[PDB]
Amino acid sequence: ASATRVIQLLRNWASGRDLQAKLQLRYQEISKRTQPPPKLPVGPSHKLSNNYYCTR
């Protein structure tokens, strides 16, 4: 956030809480809009042997 400290004090007094601690606008703590690629694990039926479909 970014505002005058006297306005922050007035806000805290009127609301009764420290507003700055839990700001409702996301300034910079959220995840990046670009991420590394994933890998994604395969399922339990991805076996090469002992996997006849009639048993599952």
Partner 1 sequence: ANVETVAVSPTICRRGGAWFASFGRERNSGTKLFNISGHVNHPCTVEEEMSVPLKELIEKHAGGVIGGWDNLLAVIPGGSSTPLIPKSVCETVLMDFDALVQAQTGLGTAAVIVMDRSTDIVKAIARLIEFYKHESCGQCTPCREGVDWMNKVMARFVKGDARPAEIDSLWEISKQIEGHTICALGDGAAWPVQGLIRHFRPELEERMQQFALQHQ
CA distances from 24 to 15, 17, 27, 50, 52 (A): 14, 14, 9, 54, 54
CB of 10 to ligand CDL, least distance (A): 6
Interacting residues with ligand CDL between 3 and 32 (CB under 6 A): 3-4, 6-7
CB of 44 to partner 1, least distance (A): 14
Helices (H), 1-56: 5-15
Draw the binding track, 1-40, toward partner 1 (x: CB under 8 A; -: no contact).
Answer: ----------------------------------------
Q: Which two tokens stand for residue 48?
A: 């090469």
